[model samples]
Target: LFQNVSIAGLAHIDAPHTLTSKEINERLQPTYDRLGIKTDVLGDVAGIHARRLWDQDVQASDAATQAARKALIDANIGIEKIGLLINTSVSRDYLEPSTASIVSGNLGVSDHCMTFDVANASLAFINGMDIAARMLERGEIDYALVVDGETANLVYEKTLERMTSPDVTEEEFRNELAALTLGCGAAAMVMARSELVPDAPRYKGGVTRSATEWNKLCRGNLDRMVTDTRLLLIEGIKLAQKTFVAAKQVLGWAVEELDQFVIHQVSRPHTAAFVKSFGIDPAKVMTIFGEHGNIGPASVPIVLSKLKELGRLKKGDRIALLGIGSGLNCSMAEVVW
Candidate 1:
């Protein structure tokens, strides 16, 4: 029930190609046998068969820029029409100067455009969409771009190197297993005043619930991440359960009523547990995790874009964007297509 904000366009780009779980497992087989671990944990346990990766070093800004251009084309608008741009990606090129600025420069946005970055783990892209929706509602901006791009080549290479070490312990190996689930992709959306795009999907902003006490359950650093995947699975679902109750009230969402569910990309076990917990129809929710893995914040938008591309979505459909990030935060937003 936002005042005037709506999504005028949406687009996403997969990485150049994929790196299969079989390939990842082949590299870790020596370590697996050394550690007396015999399971194909990546495929059998996690339910991820493959994940995309950049064939080369594709910077976050570059990926975001490419998606942004496609989004503009989808909306049939020029860069000059964008009054704001926000880059919300876990993969970044540098610590200084915002990735938004780099993407803005690459897109050649108007000098009047406002640009910045929002780094909220996996929930940042939805956070970016909300930021843009607010401005469009207030008439502060006619249109805004929300974008994200993730790169996992370096992480995969580094994690594989560590796992193959002769002295690597079983505990250490398990801690880094989640890193193998990381994948690469990019997504962008153009949100504008509803009046400007009368036929576009209506975005009804929703609520957020957080349990910051569990924020440390999952922490990712460049090249390597130390994660207690078991704890993350348990705690993340607890937080999401509490959030869905609020969403039921705020978004008027009854699991049975929604036509389509475009939830954040995570592994098969996580997705299944969440759906079963809420009694959601699995058929209503679409997933790309088997082939795409987790794309951090870009997961939601990329799935939505793929739905649109495949013509799976229909007009007047109720769509929910579900996310649970590393900070133990859960957010649910609705869209009427």
Candidate 2:
């Protein structure tokens, strides 16, 4: 077995304000009707039931801070022990300082703590775990935290405009309309060297796959995103397939060996396709996307939080975390609890 590094604890912060996809569609009906978009964009197409939104305007920093505290508590560790802190959300607080520093301040991290942000669409949390594991393996850091807080309110509030615009064409407007399915949420994970966390779940290195060809499939501006929706889906699945092949080979993963599969909650079909492609049992993969939409980088850890809540994990059970981000990056890892 690889040098084992464990996760002391994990947590996720869902947006306090909530809205079902139905309610969101109601608010967006004016634009949908205006644009003559009769299709159920967020409902039937994506199979998304509901998604959350922040209050008025909440920065990513505030959301991440809340989740970080919960993770710190779960680990049963004081805030001072955190040697490294990484924020993995796709949401940005500002173009200047990294969101990691702001979250560090809110969490009351010590001066010895090192903080930074890992930005890669949605695969960031997985990357953060591996990075922390390396530090633990090297005996460099005693404790570390990976956190993400996604605010889809930014996309929802704005996309309604173009969806409601009369001049919008089906070809041109579908991309912006896609944002309506976004939901705001957050997640965090606390990990440390196993010697100090003998009872915690160990993290095993997984796999990574990339598709530079789809690099520009999705791009975001200050307030909005423009994406080649179909292209993104096609390329993302292609990338995920390659990653899965490597996962099976490197991790010695077979369906019967994996207790649960926590996949990135990008959308409904995305989940369906992944499971179907691998012939994976649908029941093994816990999904929050129906209610939470895409939580950005927080998706995987959010699923982990749910697994813990349900007591779905057993000691020594093999849990697989699969991810795909904006950079067309894919990562898969094993969690042994």
Candidate 3:
């Protein structure tokens, strides 16, 4: 639990181009006809009508930098005030120098501003948030930035090419269907010591539970992803159940107590299963998966930022940050608005 850490500001960006499932299906018409597959899986089964995409040339750093600037404006502070910056996106510019460094450079952060990247699939944003909160609680940093920018453009292009092959197997198509559900977007948060923003939302760090035994359930790279969607839903929920039990012990979490649930969304079925299993009120959860698909680590923060923009949260309201990421990792954190 953190006594001094608070979220001073937050922001999200919707990618400019809309890519509908209908268009994707039209492109795959040949393969669909050849395979005799009649299901409109992307739209009907996944419940994803559309997702966003950036220009072909946009990289993760550029997206992150854009969201960071907006977040700084929301925080009402200059770049010099940010003592730390962490990038937690699955999409990255390169293997070296860290995407955080590029974004920081784009924003012209001070030399004193430490920057790094964290990777844990969708849970990395919460991981970034907790890391920043620790520093704030210890008075080590007045303010920190947690950012994520996911670009699924390359993945979509490659997956479509591969899945549309003349010899593409039904199993291969099934394994790669999740890739088509991905969308592009960016989100960023400004966390600070409570003294710096007394009215800001408080972040009380929470719990995590991992089942690495199921880690192979979903695996991906820049161009493609292979997933056992069936197993992922089952094991991910099991891990979340364990994490929630731990949260109840540590954060005193109760289903009825949380005013809002900011969850990292994978699909319509996954979200529905999670809510039904936990008995959480569906109304309390704000989901963008239908239109935005899964934006990887940016999903949670983007949803949270949307809630704020929509004026859906109130002072002293309890908010839950929840996610089950690809590492078979489940994290549950609390925020007091």
Candidate 4:
């Protein structure tokens, strides 16, 4: 519903290290044998061959700062031009001293710039985009930056250690399997008033539907995650169906109309289920899950940035931003390229 908001620029970063499922499975062979689990779940069942990892010393702020600088360059603006910066990532430097503040300090943003962090699992990037678009429409800021950075190195290291233990139960191993689908990356976007960037893509704010009753389906911390994979797939699709109904009413959304669907990377089954339910063209949806896995909130923007970099989008093409996050939340938004 935003009339004056546009996406001025976008950028993303890929973590340097690649961690393959084969290698992880090799390390867990003994545990798999002990538990009588013979299937190659990470590669065969989950359809995730590999995922990326940050260096041991890298923090979330560093990655966000890196992508922010590139995004500013892409926007053809200086740090002084940004009046707002929101960091929306599950990976963070600390519980206090917001990661947005650290990224702002790293970017040397003006004292007038407002900064904070938003946490809503994988949907936070779209949440951040919606928040910035409101300001752009009202002319409260000439430009704003929404950024995310995710690091799965710690989770992979810790999960692998725990899952490999001699006494690890089958249920414990199955619960933590979703953690292996995670990857490390960062993404940032520059949003501006339509008047400021006349040729930029229009961002029409969309709809959100939440089912917090199912919030316990997936829970995680720095190093561990327990997911009811079956229930998550079942209920996540149900929520997305409801959200799509709202999108149709508000954004006039139709499956055949959207040129691209930029989805938050999860697993193969989840993506397949969503696409099948919506009758969306699988070819229109670009997926990086096979190589990069799920990068949390960064996944959507990273995929969008990749589409831009690859020259996959055309002017006036309709693009859908879709995700179902851990809060049992589903959001569907649109971009006119």
Point to the candidate with the largest lDDT: 4
Reference-based lDDT, each prediction: 0.90, 0.83, 0.91, 0.92
Clashing pairs in 2: 21-50, 31-164, 316-337
Mind giving the per-residue lDDT tens digits that candidate 1 earns over 1-337? Answer: 5878889999999997878989888888888887889899889989899999887768889899999999999999999999999999999889889999999999999989999999999999989998888888888999999999899889888888888899899999888889989899999999999999999999988999998998787888667777889988989888888988999988788988899888887788888999999889899889898998999999999999999999888899999888879998889999999
In model 2, where do residues sit more than 4 Å from their true spots? 30-36
Q: Which residue segments of model 3 deviate by more than 4 Å?
A: none
TM-scores for all predictions: 0.98, 0.95, 0.98, 0.99
Off by over 4 Å in 4: none
The worst-scoring run of ten residues by lDDT in candidate 2 lies at: 157-166
Candidate 1 regions exceeding 4 Å error are none
Cα lDDT tens digits, model 4, 1-337, are 8999999999999999998988988999999888988799889888999999988989999999999999999999999999999999999879999999999999999999999999999999999999998887787898999999998888899999999888899989989989999999999999999988899999998999999999899999887888999999898889988998899888998898789999888989988988898788899989999999999999999999999999888899999999769989889999999
lDDT of 3 by residue, 166-228 (tens): 889999999999999999999999999998898899988889889989878999998989999
* Count of backbone collisions within predicted model 1: 1
Candidate 1, lDDT over the whole model: 0.90
| Error at 129, model 3, angstroms | 0.7
- By lDDT rank, best first, the candidates go 4, 3, 1, 2
Clashes per model (N, Cα, C within 3 A): 1, 3, 1, 1
Q: How high is the lDDT of residue 3 in model 3?
A: 84
Ranking 1 against 4 by lDDT, winner: 4
RMSD of each: 0.9, 1.6, 0.9, 0.8
